[model samples]
Target: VNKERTFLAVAPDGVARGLVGEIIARYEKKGFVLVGLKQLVPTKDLAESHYAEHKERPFFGGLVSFITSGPVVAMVFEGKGVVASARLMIGVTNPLASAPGSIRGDFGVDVGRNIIHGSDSVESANREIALWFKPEELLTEVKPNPNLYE
Candidate 1:
C-alpha cells in the first residue's frame, strides 16, 4: 500500500546553477526510483497549464516567465509516499525557513529561485505527472524498496 509517485522539476535557476545532479542524488539516496526524466526549455503554454492554479494571482506571469527562461529538468520519482516525501525533501517554499538539510534549505536564497518544485499532494501529483509526462514516457514497472512500507 505504500506505492506512490510525484512530479518534480529543477527550475531554470537550479539548472543554470548546475544543481540537477545534486537534486537527483538526494532522491536517489532516499531510495526513490526515477521513472521519467527530460531536460527542456518549457513552452509558454506548458508553463501556463502547469501553473494554472496560480493564473489568477499577480505573480503568475513572473512564475511562467522564470520557468520558461532556461532548461528545466522535469522528472518523475516513484516510491513510498513519494508526493509527501519529495516535498519534505524540497523543504518549505521559503528556503530560509526550511530545515538546513533540505534541498532548498541547502541551495536557495530567493523564493523566485527556489531551486526546485515538488508536487504538494497526491491529487496534485497525479495532475502534475500527467501534465509533464505522457503515459508512454513513465515506467509501468516501478519496483521500489520492499522494506520502505514499514
Candidate 2:
C-alpha cells in the first residue's frame, strides 16, 4: 500500500538551476518509479490555490512570488514508503541545515528557495498530485532495474 503514490515538487529554482534531471536521477537510483511529470509555469491563481493552506502565514506572498517566478517541473513518483523516503532525499527546508547528500543540503540555499518539495504525508501527496497533474498524467508501469533495490 505504501508503494502506491508519492508526489514531488520541483520548484522553479530546481528547474532554473537545471537540476530536474539530477533530482529525478536520485529517485530513480533509489528504486522509486516515475509515475507522472510536467513542466509548467504555474499561474498566480494556481499558486494561490495550491498554497491556500499557507495564505495566513507571513511568507505566503513570498512563496507565491517565488513559485510563480519561473517554470517548475512537477512530478509524482511511487515506491514503498516513498513519501518519507522522498523527503529524506530532499533534505531540510534550508540547505544549510540539511545533511551532506540530501537534495537541499547539496543544492538549496534557504527554506523559501528550497530546490525541491516532497509531500509531508500520504494524504498531502494525493492532494498535491491531483493539483499538479491530471488523472491521465500518471504512468503505471514498473521498470526493470534490479540494481536499484537491495
Candidate 3:
C-alpha cells in the first residue's frame, strides 16, 4: 500500500542555483510518484501561512522574504512512508552538518540556503499538501508501478 504522500519545495536559492532537476531526480529514483507539481513565486500570504509554525520567531520574517524572493518548485510525492523517507533524503536542517549523501549535504553550504523543504511528519505532510495543491490538481488514481512494491 503505497498510499502515503509528502510535500517538498525547492527553495529560492536552490532554484537560482539550478538544482531543481537534481532534487526531483532523487525523489523519482526513490520510486515515489510525483502526483502534483508547480513552479510559482510565492506570495506574502502564502509564505507567511506556510511557515506559520515559526510565526513568532525572529527568523520568521527572513523565512518569508527568502521564500518569496524567487520561484519555488512545489511538489507532492506519494508512496509508502514517504514523509519520513523524504526527511531522511533531505538531511538535517543545517547543511554543513548534514551527512554526505543527503540533498542538503550534497549541495548546500549554509543553514539559510539548505536548498529544499520536506515535511517533517505525516500530519505536517497532509497539511502542506493541502496548502500547496488543490484537489483537482493532484491525481486521484495513481497507477501502480509493479517494481516499487509487492
Best-performing candidate as measured by TM-score: 3
Evaluated at residue 95, the lDDT of candidate 1 is 90
lDDT of 3 at 107: 93
TM-score of each: 0.95, 0.91, 0.97
Model 3 agreement with the true structure over 32-70: per-residue lDDT tens digits: 999999999999988998999999999999999999999
lDDT of 1 by residue, 1-150 (tens): 456889999999999999899999999989999999999999999999999999999999999999999999999998878899998889998998889999999999888889999988899999999999999999988877777555
C-alpha positional error of residue 54 in candidate 3 after TM-score superposition, expressed in Å: 0.7
Better model by lDDT: candidate 2 vs candidate 3? 3
lDDT of each: 0.91, 0.84, 0.93
Instruction: Kindly report which residue stretches of model 2 are placed more than 4 angstroms away from their true locations once superposed.
Output: 141-150
Provide the clash count, candidate 1: 0
- Give me the candidate number with maximum lDDT: 3
Off by over 4 Å in 3: none
Better of 1 and 2 by lDDT: 1
Model 1 misplaced regions, further than 4 Å: 146-150
Ranking by TM-score: 3, 1, 2
Model 1 clash pairs are none
